[PDB]
Write an enzyme that holds these catalytic residues in place. Structure first.
Site, PDB file in Angstrom:
ATOM      1  N   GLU B  28       1.022  -1.157   0.142  1.00  0.00           N
ATOM      2  CA  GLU B  28      -0.094  -0.450   0.163  1.00  0.00           C
ATOM      3  C   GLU B  28       0.652   1.258   0.236  1.00  0.00           C
ATOM      4  O   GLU B  28       0.015   2.538  -0.250  1.00  0.00           O
ATOM      5  CB  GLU B  28      -0.855   0.128   1.241  1.00  0.00           C
ATOM      6  CG  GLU B  28      -2.028  -1.414   1.521  1.00  0.00           C
ATOM      7  CD  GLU B  28      -3.070  -0.745   2.234  1.00  0.00           C
ATOM      8  OE1 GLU B  28      -3.032  -0.920   3.522  1.00  0.00           O
ATOM      9  OE2 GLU B  28      -4.411  -0.369   1.009  1.00  0.00           O
ATOM     10  N   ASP B  32       8.394   7.200  -4.543  1.00  0.00           N
ATOM     11  CA  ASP B  32       9.169   8.694  -4.950  1.00  0.00           C
ATOM     12  C   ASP B  32       9.844   8.230  -6.001  1.00  0.00           C
ATOM     13  O   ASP B  32      10.163   7.323  -5.912  1.00  0.00           O
ATOM     14  CB  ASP B  32       8.920   8.755  -3.802  1.00  0.00           C
ATOM     15  CG  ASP B  32       8.389  10.349  -3.330  1.00  0.00           C
ATOM     16  OD1 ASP B  32       7.460  10.324  -3.248  1.00  0.00           O
ATOM     17  OD2 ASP B  32       8.907  11.195  -3.182  1.00  0.00           O
ATOM     18  N   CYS B  57      10.303  18.918  -5.586  1.00  0.00           N
ATOM     19  CA  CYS B  57      11.238  19.250  -3.888  1.00  0.00           C
ATOM     20  C   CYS B  57      12.749  18.671  -4.339  1.00  0.00           C
ATOM     21  O   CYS B  57      13.304  17.337  -4.749  1.00  0.00           O
ATOM     22  CB  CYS B  57      10.911  18.620  -2.424  1.00  0.00           C
ATOM     23  SG  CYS B  57       9.094  18.718  -2.689  1.00  0.00           S
ATOM     24  N   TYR B  79       9.232  22.384   4.462  1.00  0.00           N
ATOM     25  CA  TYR B  79       9.931  23.435   3.349  1.00  0.00           C
ATOM     26  C   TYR B  79      11.021  24.466   3.982  1.00  0.00           C
ATOM     27  O   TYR B  79      10.825  24.578   4.945  1.00  0.00           O
ATOM     28  CB  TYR B  79       8.492  23.729   2.833  1.00  0.00           C
ATOM     29  CG  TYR B  79       7.862  22.455   2.647  1.00  0.00           C
ATOM     30  CD1 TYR B  79       7.090  21.832   3.336  1.00  0.00           C
ATOM     31  CD2 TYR B  79       7.947  22.181   0.713  1.00  0.00           C
ATOM     32  CE1 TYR B  79       6.166  21.010   3.022  1.00  0.00           C
ATOM     33  CE2 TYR B  79       6.881  21.160   0.428  1.00  0.00           C
ATOM     34  CZ  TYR B  79       6.135  20.233   1.554  1.00  0.00           C
ATOM     35  OH  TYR B  79       5.200  19.313   1.168  1.00  0.00           O
ATOM     36  N   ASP B  84      15.031  29.725  -7.541  1.00  0.00           N
ATOM     37  CA  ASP B  84      15.062  29.688  -8.140  1.00  0.00           C
ATOM     38  C   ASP B  84      16.517  30.714  -8.483  1.00  0.00           C
ATOM     39  O   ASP B  84      17.410  31.182  -7.882  1.00  0.00           O
ATOM     40  CB  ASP B  84      14.315  30.558  -9.775  1.00  0.00           C
ATOM     41  CG  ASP B  84      12.995  30.172  -9.488  1.00  0.00           C
ATOM     42  OD1 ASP B  84      12.233  31.016  -9.889  1.00  0.00           O
ATOM     43  OD2 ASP B  84      12.341  28.858  -9.580  1.00  0.00           O
ATOM     44  N   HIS B 120      10.521  28.839  -8.111  1.00  0.00           N
ATOM     45  CA  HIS B 120       9.167  27.233  -8.692  1.00  0.00           C
ATOM     46  C   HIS B 120      10.182  25.912  -7.650  1.00  0.00           C
ATOM     47  O   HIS B 120      10.170  25.260  -8.548  1.00  0.00           O
ATOM     48  CB  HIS B 120       9.603  27.134  -9.957  1.00  0.00           C
ATOM     49  CG  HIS B 120       8.806  29.108 -10.524  1.00  0.00           C
ATOM     50  ND1 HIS B 120       9.434  29.594 -10.498  1.00  0.00           N
ATOM     51  CD2 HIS B 120       7.980  28.770 -10.754  1.00  0.00           C
ATOM     52  CE1 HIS B 120       8.617  30.711 -11.095  1.00  0.00           C
ATOM     53  NE2 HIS B 120       8.088  30.640 -10.399  1.00  0.00           N
ATOM     54  N   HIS B 137      11.093  10.579   3.424  1.00  0.00           N
ATOM     55  CA  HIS B 137      12.226  11.073   1.720  1.00  0.00           C
ATOM     56  C   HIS B 137      13.174  11.408   1.581  1.00  0.00           C
ATOM     57  O   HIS B 137      13.806  11.368   0.483  1.00  0.00           O
ATOM     58  CB  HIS B 137      11.522  10.805   0.826  1.00  0.00           C
ATOM     59  CG  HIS B 137       9.605   9.486   0.461  1.00  0.00           C
ATOM     60  ND1 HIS B 137       9.449   9.061   1.566  1.00  0.00           N
ATOM     61  CD2 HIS B 137       9.813   9.147  -0.681  1.00  0.00           C
ATOM     62  CE1 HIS B 137       8.599   7.930   1.409  1.00  0.00           C
ATOM     63  NE2 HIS B 137       8.675   8.156   0.061  1.00  0.00           N
ATOM     64  N   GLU B 158       5.835  12.267  -6.630  1.00  0.00           N
ATOM     65  CA  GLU B 158       5.666  11.565  -6.169  1.00  0.00           C
ATOM     66  C   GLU B 158       5.021  10.631  -7.567  1.00  0.00           C
ATOM     67  O   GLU B 158       4.302  11.756  -8.443  1.00  0.00           O
ATOM     68  CB  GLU B 158       4.376  11.477  -5.057  1.00  0.00           C
ATOM     69  CG  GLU B 158       5.153  12.342  -4.164  1.00  0.00           C
ATOM     70  CD  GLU B 158       4.704  13.745  -3.216  1.00  0.00           C
ATOM     71  OE1 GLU B 158       5.093  14.645  -4.779  1.00  0.00           O
ATOM     72  OE2 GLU B 158       4.565  14.995  -2.784  1.00  0.00           O
TER      73      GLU B 158
END
Ligand SMILES: O=C(CO)[C@H](O)[C@H](O)COP(=O)(O)O
Ligand SMILES: O=C(CO)[C@H](O)[C@H](O)COP(=O)(O)O
Lengths: 196, 196
Positions: B28, B32, B57, B79, B84, B120, B137, B158
Site C-alpha cells: 500500500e 517516489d 522538491c 520546506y 530559482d 519554483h 523521503h 511522487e
C-alpha cells in the site's frame, strides 16, 4: 477563429470548465489552464496535474489572503506561505487533497485555523484592481471568477507537452483545446472587455 | 524479486539514474522518484514532472540549506522558502530551469545571492543523522547521495497514475520500474544497510 468571446468563456467558467489562457494573440505565448477555485473536483485537479507542470497555484485577492492569514512567502508572482486544508486531507498532495484545499480557500466560511502551513497548495495574492493594475495570470484568475459572479479565487497551472516537457505555445494549446473541448482566451481580450 | 540490493542501487544512482523509493515492503506504500540533485538534466526533469505530482522538491542537509540562506518557510516535511537559480533561467518553472536550479542547489560553489526567492523549486531540510533520525523521503534522498559519494542533495517527486491521478502504490511502481527500466528500493532496506 482561435479565441472564444469573453461572455461565452465566462459561462463555461461559471459551469466549472477550464479555460486555456494566453497573455495575448502571440504564437509564442505559453498557455495556462485556469478554472474557478470553488468548482475544482478531484477529477479536474487530476486533469490539471496530468497536463501541467504540477506547480498548482491558487490566486486569491489580497483581502481574502489577509482574512485567511496567508502572508507573502517573503516578508512577480506573489506567493504566500503554502497550505493544506486540515479536515479531510492526509498526504495533502493527492488530487483529492489539493482539490479540497483549493475549494476551501474559495469558501467564504473558511477560517485561518482551518489550514495547516506549510502545505501542498501555493496561494497567490492578486493585486487590488486586478487586470487593470497587473496583467498577470494571477489577476486574470481572480478577474474571471469575479466576472463569473463567483468567489474571487481561481486555480491555475502551466500546460506542458507530453513529448518533451516543454511548455505549450499557442499552436499546441489550440490542439489541446480542440482535443479536450476547452475554450481559449487571452488576457488582452479580457482587459478590453472590462475597459469597454 | 521486487527490491534492488542497496549497493547495486547506489551504482545506478551514482550513474544519474532515478530510483523508485518506498517506505518499506508494504503493497500500500506510494512510490517516489528520487535521483541525485547534481545529475538531473532538462530531460530527466521533464521525465520526473511528466510522471509525478509536479510538486518537485530538493532535499538538502540543514547545514547546506543554512549555507545557501534557505530558511524554513515557516517558524512533517521541512520546506524552506522556494527559489530559482538566477543565471540561466527565465520562467523558472520550465524543465530546463527547474533542473538548473536543482543542480545549482547541489553545487558546492553556489552562493546565497545566486538564487532568487521565492521561486519554483521547493528545497527541503533533511535532519542531521538522516535516516537514523527521521525515516522521511527527504532524509532518504540526502542519504542516497551521501552513500553515493555525491553532494548531500537530491530531488524527488511522487509518482502518479495517468488514468486517474491517484498516487502509485507498490504494484503500479513495479510496473513503472519495469516499463522504464528503473530500480526500486525501500527506506527500511536502506536503514538496515547503514546500520549494524
Ligand atoms: O500563470 C503562471 C505563469 O505564467 C503561474 O500560475 C504563476 O504562478 C502566476 O502567474 P503570474 O505571475 O502572471 O500572475
Ligand atoms: O516524498 C514525498 C512524499 O512522501 C515528498 O517529496 C515530500 O516532500 C518529502 O517526504 P518526507 O516528508 O517523507 O521527507
Amino acid at each position: 477563429n482561435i479565441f472564444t468571446p469573453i461572455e461565452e468563456a465566462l459561462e463555461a467558467y461559471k459551469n466549472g470548465e477550464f479555460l486555456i489562457v494566453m497573455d495575448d494573440e502571440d504564437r509564442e505565448n505559453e498557455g495556462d489552464l485556469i478554472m474557478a477555485a470553488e468548482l475544482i473536483t478531484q477529477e479536474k485537479m487530476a486533469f490539471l496535474v496530468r497536463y501541467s507542470s504540477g506547480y498548482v497555484c491558487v490566486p486569491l485577492s489580497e483581502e481574502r489572503a489577509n482574512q485567511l492569514e496567508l502572508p507573502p512567502m517573503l516578508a512577480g508572482t506573489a506567493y504566500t506561505i503554502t497550505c493544506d486544508f486540515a479536515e479531510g486531507t492526509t498526504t495533502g498532495i493527492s488530487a483529492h487533497d489539493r482539490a479540497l484545499t483549493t475549494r476551501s480557500l474559495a469558501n467564504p466560511n473558511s477560517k485561518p485555523q482551518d489550514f495547516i502551513k506549510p502545505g501542498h497548495i501555493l496561494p497567490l495574492r492578486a493585486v487590488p484592481g486586478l487586470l487593470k493594475k497587473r496583467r498577470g495570470h494571477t489577476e486574470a484568475a481572480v478577474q474571471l471568477s469575479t466576472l463569473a459572479g463567483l468567489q474571487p479565487a481561481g486555480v491555475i497551472c502551466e500546460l506542458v507537452r507530453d513529448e518533451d516537457g516543454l511548455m505549450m505555445r499557442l499552436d499546441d494549446c489550440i490542439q489541446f483545446g480542440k482535443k479536450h473541448g476547452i475554450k481559449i482566451i487571452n488576457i488582452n481580450q479580457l482587459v478590453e472587455y472590462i475597459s469597454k
